[PDB]
């Protein structure tokens, strides 16, 4: 096993290469290990920021909306996340 923060770094590496699929794989694993109570400097909101965008790029529309809502719930002053939420809610008529 890699640590939570290692997996997060892997997900960020994939994302910075424009590899959204591998971003999802790593960030999903991060969330699993955070839910298991593993210690980490990375926060769930930071993971959700990468993951929500990556799942959208892969065409997973209502999941991207769900994760964007969760992101904002944990980071309400995240202006970009708020803009994303408005986009997805208008796109999917989920306003």
């Amino acid at each position: 096993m890699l640590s939570v923060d290692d997996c997060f770094g892997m997900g960020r590496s994939a994302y910075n290469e424009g590899d959204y699929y591998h971003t999802v794989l790593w960030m999903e694993q991060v969330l699993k290990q955070l839910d298991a109570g593993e210690e980490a400097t990375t926060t769930k909101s930071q993971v959700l920021d990468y993951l929500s965008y990556a799942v959208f790029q892969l065409g997973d529309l209502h999941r991207a909306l769900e994760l964007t809502r969760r992101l904002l719930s944990l980071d309400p002053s995240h202006e970009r996340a708020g803009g994303n939420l408005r986009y997805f809610e208008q796109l999917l008529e989920e306003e």
């Binding site: 960020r12 994302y15 910075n16 920021d49 990468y50 929500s52 965008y53 990556a54 959208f56 991207a64 964007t68 970009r80 803009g83 994303n84 986009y87 997805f88």
Partner: peptide, 9 residues
């Protein structure tokens, strides 16, 4: 264009 924006890096 009209869309979301992810982390800059």
């Amino acid at each position: 264009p009209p869309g979301p924006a992810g982390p800059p890096g």
